[PDB]
Amino acid sequence: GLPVMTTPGSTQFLTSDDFQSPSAMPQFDVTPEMQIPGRVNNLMEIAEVDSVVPVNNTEA
Amino acid sequence: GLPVMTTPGSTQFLTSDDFQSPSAMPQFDVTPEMQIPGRVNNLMEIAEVDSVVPVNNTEANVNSLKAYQIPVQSNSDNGKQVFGFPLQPGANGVLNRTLLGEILNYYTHWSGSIKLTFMFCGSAMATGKFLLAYSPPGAGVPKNRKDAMLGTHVIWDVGLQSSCVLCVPWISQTHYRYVVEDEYTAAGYITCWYQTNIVVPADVQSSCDILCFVSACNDFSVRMLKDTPFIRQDTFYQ
Amino acid sequence: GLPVMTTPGSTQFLTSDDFQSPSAMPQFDVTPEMQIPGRVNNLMEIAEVDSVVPVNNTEA
Amino acid sequence: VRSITLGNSTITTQECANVVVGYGVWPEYLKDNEATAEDQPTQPDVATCRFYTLESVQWMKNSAGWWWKLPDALSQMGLFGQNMQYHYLGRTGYTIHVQCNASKFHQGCLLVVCVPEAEMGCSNLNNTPEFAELSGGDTARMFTDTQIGETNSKKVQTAVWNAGMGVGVGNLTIYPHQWINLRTNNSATIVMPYINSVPMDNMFRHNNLTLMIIPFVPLNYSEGSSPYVPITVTIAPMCAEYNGLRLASSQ
Amino acid sequence: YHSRSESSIENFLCRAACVYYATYTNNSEKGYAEWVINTRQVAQLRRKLELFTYLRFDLELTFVITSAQQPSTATSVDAPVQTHQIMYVPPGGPVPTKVTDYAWQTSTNPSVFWTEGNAPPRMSIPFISIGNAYSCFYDGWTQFSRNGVYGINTLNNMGTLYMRHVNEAGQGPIKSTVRIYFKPKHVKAWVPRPPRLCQYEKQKNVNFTPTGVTTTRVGITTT
Amino acid sequence: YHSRSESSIENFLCRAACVYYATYTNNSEKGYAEWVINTRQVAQLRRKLELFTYLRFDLELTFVITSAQQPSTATSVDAPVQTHQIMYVPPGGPVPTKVTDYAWQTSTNPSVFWTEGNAPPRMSIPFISIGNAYSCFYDGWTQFSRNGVYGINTLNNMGTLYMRHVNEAGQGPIKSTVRIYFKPKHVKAWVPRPPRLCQYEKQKNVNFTPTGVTTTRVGITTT
Amino acid sequence: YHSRSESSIENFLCRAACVYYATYTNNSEKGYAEWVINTRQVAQLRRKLELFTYLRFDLELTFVITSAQQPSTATSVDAPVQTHQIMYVPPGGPVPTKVTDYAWQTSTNPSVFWTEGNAPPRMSIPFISIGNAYSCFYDGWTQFSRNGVYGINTLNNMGTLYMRHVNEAGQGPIKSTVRIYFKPKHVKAWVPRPPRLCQYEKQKNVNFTPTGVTTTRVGITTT
Amino acid sequence: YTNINYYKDAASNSANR
Amino acid sequence: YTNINYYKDAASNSANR
Amino acid sequence: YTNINYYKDAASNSANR
Amino acid sequence: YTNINYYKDAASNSANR
Amino acid sequence: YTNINYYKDAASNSANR
Ligand SMILES: CCCCCCCCCCCCCCCC(=O)O
Ligand SMILES: CCCCCCCCCCCCCCCC(=O)O
Ligand SMILES: CCCCCCCCCCCCCCCC(=O)O
């Protein structure tokens, strides 16, 4: 076969990696997408929504 | 050599993978292909073929052809029920072992209309009208012809047609229903009622039989291949 | 290095495989080819040559 | 209204009889590009491609069903059987015509189905059925509404609801079939092509087809109506071909 | 001049998280493990998912399988490398009842065979819901009479995982643990929801014990 | 709007299924295994194939080989990694009679050597029938006199697999099991047949014990 | 309409065949193995080659090396993975006489180092004959006086293979077997010869014991 | 490489980044 | 890669999908 | 790949098929 | 190969030489 | 492949043949 040389990091499982993997369900036909209100694309959209501040945070 | 890095999944054997492998018989000359009738390209073609439904699946009829015979006779009353079964093509005994039901048990989800055909097998002198109804779930099974006629239904006249083809529509909240029984994906009920009566002349048997057939319509589909629960084993077959 | 994933069949030795392998004698200068009579390209050529049939194959 | 003529024999059906054609394939002679035998084939045509009528059977009120193995059922029919005996290889289609007439005061329904490669199971699990049990030539072999005991060493398990093949009898409609409902029809016509994994085969060692007639709704009538209702089967080979002419085989 | 790339739904959810781990020993016929697939048995991934009401994603599955030698009385225990089988049984399919069950033929069920010492096994799964999106919350019942099961558990029909040792037992028992990791990919989210404040109590419902809105300080002006 | 991709014959059959497994121990000259190749010894793949009368496909072969340490009396058993040989003997070829047989030279027979701890061995096989298609059912005999063998077994002449330990035995016996997996590819099917209803009884025939057509319910109106 | 691809000389000969195997133990200074390279010590490949008088091919070499633990008295034998060295010594080159010989420096001799548990080592060899083709048969002598050696052995001057354990011996002896596999490639053949009928008797000559031309039957008409 | 899908299914692709 | 046959025999190819 | 020689020597090439 | 980035992040690249 | 240098240093190259 083609000569190759394995580098460090081979066989490791890094939780934040981004690789392709084989599908366990080939040619699966997914349910069609449906328009749902309130699509969120970034957590900053949640962070930009006003929420009530508990300024009087005494024990009582 | 060229620098490479092996990722997770290396050396694994996944039964549904799709890879190339070396041939153990290089340059093997296969036998020429020959035209054979009845080529099949999709299991839905099998599922679309009508098969006889054992609607009379009582304990005393499953070991004979009486399981497929739906009794019918001349009555002295009105609006009696002929039969009724849930629309559970993959989990209910009535439809479990037909062609459609057998194809369904290899899968997990299903969607589409179901074609039900009823053929009257009485004498040519017999007459009668029947109400075939499909009730979507949410309420119970209809308990009388009045309840049955409030849903989807058709009137079948055996005197005019020996075969009625009722196509049960797909009415569901989800795009697919589970093959196994699950109340969240209940599909409803199918019932048949006397619309008028069976009426025969003298010297004609009043008791007749109806045969029911089931098949998938053109919009039927299945998903999530699985092993069927109908075949099992204890040791290798010798 | 380049990300790769090893499939089943890796490291196996199949007697009818067809792969390239490194040469143990780099740049070896082979003896020149010489025309020899009776070149054979297919065993069917041998099978197409008439041979005497032992039809009288009794034990004696 | 509609008459079908093959050779010197003719049958008649209604103009709307709805002939069922196999898997949509009409019988045809073997093409050169898919033939393996090299000798010139024998095509007797009119002498063999004609309607042969087998012995009639009686549809009784308790009848479970009947079956015929197709090439064997015509093994003693005129020149077709002679060519079968004198040739090593053969291929043919069929036109199966089943006749059963009854008055408008009778009721009953039959399933007429042609099953390719209908391998049958034996009553004894350790054995296989013998030829006499598997086929009776012209004579029809009968299905049974009961279960054959395991004592019988070489009989066919003839329980109708499994159809001798360990399947569901109501699922037999996947094979080319027609329904004879006495209310509407009195005959069924199924045209079947040659179906095999090889272009030609030996007609004695291999039964390519099996015709089954199974009453799904039993015959019934009132007192006074004719109680004897026969079923008559007429079969015509179509595009029969033969190869390997030699001495006649004993069987 | 500051990008919000790392606060995307993808980056927020596309990190592998342990959802469960099971154990099985090679010293019995019942030496297999099962797990009904759900994302509600672990606090972290459950809370991350429950920031939204509906989700639609593909899934990357990674398994970390480790083994430990159990006590034995045989002298000179020398065991070969161990091979494991993980089989997915969709609802309605036959389930194994013992290690040597016929169901492990996996003729149609997807299964993965993996030998110890190699890279962790990994496979991808598409969006397999019967609906148009996964549901994190369901304010409803399974029965039309509004009796019986109430809540999100009505929608959980995702199947079961089965795990076993392929190798026949040797001269000493081996106990193995398989850790299951979920990584959503190609994520779509809808209807943002307040982050879970009270600690989780049960897998199949949202039951909680009341807790204060925040931590406390002495007075309204304390800095 | 709904595709039927997963109900194709390819997707239905192109899944690896165990067809057999054999065992052999390294403690004897008869420590090899043999198997006459056939697809009728397992219920699941047999039923999937027998939905059709004739089939034509290529085959992917995958072997899962595992070993277990057998009891021994020697102190400090320390065995090196094990190498296995699987040889295919077409009909008519010489067959091994012992582990050290000359037939294992495999000069023309295809064979595969594989060492434990690596990925499972895998090879592809073309359509090797003498006919134009494989036959699942055969309503006929092998003899022209219609005596003797009846059924599908007349057409089974696919050969035999032989398996052995390459390594010479050490200080403790090792028992190995090889699991054979078939995966049809490039499948063509003809003449659909009713699904098998009665349970299988024998490998070489269709023998069955009569069973009811369906499960039962109380009455014709029971829901 | 039928191709003769599989009866080509290439397909007929391009299959790996075992030509020899040797053993060596790590418990002595003489714990190495040697083999004078020749294709006449195995029946199958020899017969396949001897269908022709002259051959010209490249060669693919593959080694299958396995080890077995030998009896020992030390408690707790724990040996690391073993590394092997195979050295080719062309005729005239110095030959090793012990495991720790200086000749294993292999400064110019081609050698291969391989560790157990990996894929089998493999290398390619060109056509290395001093003539224009390899000779399977030689009706002649080595001496001009027609005395001494007669036959094909006069032309065999292909060298010797040497094999040894690289690792120093530990607390228990290890016996290793190396199997040598030849696979001719890019083959050219000339002068077809009748297939060998009598069984082989010796490596260096064509000596045979007379045997009948075929098996027998009762009479000239027996079928 | 830079970006090439090795599988026929969309679920096999890497994350959307 | 996307789709390249690595072997000279058709039986070596992946499934028809 | 389909067919690329990885070595500078002809003896390294695969079989002639 | 000669020079192709296999990752979408600049930090994954090799050294600047 | 046929001939592609995988490294930025000339000493990494294979032999001159
Ligand atoms: C060996 C093959 C393994 C196959 C495993 C298939 C796993 C099924 C997919 C589970 C999806 C879970 C979705 C969670 C929905 C939610 O957020 O409530
Ligand atoms: C080490 C090399 C192994 C080679 C193994 C060759 C296997 C022979 C091919 C078997 C095909 C089986 C076809 C089944 C036919 C049927 O459906 O009845
Ligand atoms: C570690 C490097 C190993 C190198 C081994 C070199 C082997 C020498 C080549 C032997 C060729 C044999 C030709 C046989 C001729 C015949 O047919 O008589």
Author numbering:
A (entry chain 3), C (entry chain 3): 1 to 60
B (entry chain 3): 1 to 238
D (entry chain 2): 13 to 263
E (entry chain 1), F (entry chain 1), G (entry chain 1): 56 to 278
H (entry chain 4), I (entry chain 4), J (entry chain 4), K (entry chain 4), L (entry chain 4): 27 to 43
The article reads:
Through cryoEM and single-particle image processing, two distinct particle populations were separated. These particle populations were termed compact and expanded, structurally corresponding to mature native CVB1 virions and CVB1 A-particles respectively. Particle sets were processed in cryoEM and Scipion to 2.15 Å resolution reaching Nyqvist. The structure and position of VP0 in VLPs corresponds to VP2 and VP4 in mature virions, however lacking a 39 residues long section on the inside of the capsid and missing an N-terminus and myristoyl group. Furthermore, N-terminus arms embracing the VP4 in the native CVB1 could not be modelled prior to residue 56 in the CVB1-VLPTween80. Other characteristic structural features of native CVB1 are seen, such as the VP1 around the 5-fold, lipid factor inside the hydrophobic pocket, VP0 helices on the sides of the 2-fold symmetry axis and VP0 and VP3 alternating around a 3-fold. At the current resolution, an ion coordinated between three D203 at the 3-fold can be observed in both expanded and compact forms. In the expanded CVB1-VLPsTween80, a forked density is present above cysteins which could be additional ion densities and in the compact CVB1-VLPTween80 two conformations of VP3 R232 are resolved. Here we observed two structural differences of CVB1-VLPsTween80 compared to native CVB1 which are the presence of a VP3 loop in the pore of the expanded CVB1-VLPsTween80 and an additional density in the interprotomer pocket of compact CVB1-VLPTween80. Despite the lower immunizing properties, VLPs have shown to be stable for at least one month and can handle freezing and thawing while retaining almost 50% of the particles in the compact form.
